[PDB]
Symmetry: D3
Subunit: 94 residues, 6 copies
Amino acid sequence: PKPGDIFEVELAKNDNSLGISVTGGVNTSVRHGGIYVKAVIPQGAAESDGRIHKGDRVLAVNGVSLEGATHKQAVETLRNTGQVVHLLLEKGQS
Amino acid sequence: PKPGDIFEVELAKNDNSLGISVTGGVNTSVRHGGIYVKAVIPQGAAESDGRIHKGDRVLAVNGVSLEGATHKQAVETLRNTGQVVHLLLEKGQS
Amino acid sequence: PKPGDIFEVELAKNDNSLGISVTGGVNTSVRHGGIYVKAVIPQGAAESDGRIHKGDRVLAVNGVSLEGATHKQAVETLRNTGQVVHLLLEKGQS
Amino acid sequence: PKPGDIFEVELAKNDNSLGISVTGGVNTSVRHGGIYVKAVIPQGAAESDGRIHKGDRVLAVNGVSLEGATHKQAVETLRNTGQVVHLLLEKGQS
Amino acid sequence: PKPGDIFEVELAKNDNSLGISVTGGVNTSVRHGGIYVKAVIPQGAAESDGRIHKGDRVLAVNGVSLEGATHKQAVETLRNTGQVVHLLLEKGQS
Amino acid sequence: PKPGDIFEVELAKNDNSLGISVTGGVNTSVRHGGIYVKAVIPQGAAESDGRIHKGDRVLAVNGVSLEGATHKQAVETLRNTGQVVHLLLEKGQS
């Protein structure tokens, strides 16, 4: 994808983690309060898969929008998932 | 989804089980012979994922309709899959 | 698709009709009480498209299951759509 | 869909209009700057289709995110499309 | 999409044309015997839609691969469709 | 699917393998340089899943076309993936 493009992934966890950290939330001044990929963890699931990078916006998890989520809630939403997770993203770096 | 809506999931097994029991089949008097989720097994894959609930109808597995399946046939169709399974469902009533 | 396979189409109406007649519904003795394609109307939209054939089962319209529909209800659901309609189907026999 | 659910539509224009008006954008004082459906025009494309309503958020158009878009920019993004437009939404009216 | 990316479009015809011309086929010496977009016709459907460009590869039409098609067969496959057509493409080089 | 149909799968690895061996690539004399399933490994991931068979063509991996791939490039593309891999295929003859 190009920056700005929507894309979706079915991401399998490794070590029961998606291998990303997130930044943002409505409680934050992070732009518009969105949830963004802060970092892909070395040798983690996201990195091995290769489609998600720092800067991508996480729009939804398993069919549910993250709109209105505080940081705590976004993290919890990502954790409260099974071994394969459906993620909807916008490609960052535009 | 709301009751009646179509949804799809890619569900990873836990210890080779999707963690759902089903009821129904053409051989039964259940509704019109359809395959429905009887229970989401505690601690299982379907429960962790959080999208599938008791009463949802399973319409297809890995791209093949369950039409005409007996109960036994549906159970075996669900078992005879790999580690991640594509499921097409209709959301049940609350 | 082969018989039994799930497929979907986005079908544009010709002169406000999808060009399919249906058979079945829970008030009939058509198998499983399902809604099936009775005919692909000559010169109509479904015929021109080429993917839908007599005997295919219509599972959903614009994201909403036809589960439990009477014949009349199914016909209305098809008719109460805009110009392009999303249809979910099961490929029929022979 | 339930409020908060992601959904997508392929919507055909009527009289070269999708038959919805929008509110919001980065510059505006509305809802985190996101783009929301303000109204569905009577007899219009979106109304006939029946899947989009006031309050839904428009996440993307033809594969491209509306993220960071101003009002004018969003309104034009919607206009510079062809006869059928792919829309990604979040169901509103919690 | 970036060059090499898969993308899909539901394209409504304008004046009964998709507004694209193609090059290639197993009877030509075009690379891989593939079918490529030769031109997008000014003011046509593809151009208004904005997602398809010269050099993109057409992988499939309405669910069917163009693998092994001669040039005339590819053209006919494109023509022998309804008012809205599902196209699977690979993004070409710019 | 029928021969020539497009299908997609989300395939989970078993013991870090997709359970398929492929043949072809631009450097080979196989077909028109495409990447094809040579075998599915007994008791492996692809076999258990049941949708991919010898002769199917792999068109893309995780959203990126295998156009122009040498064999070694194709294999590396398959390997440089996470635990669940999105594959786009054309159903082979028979």
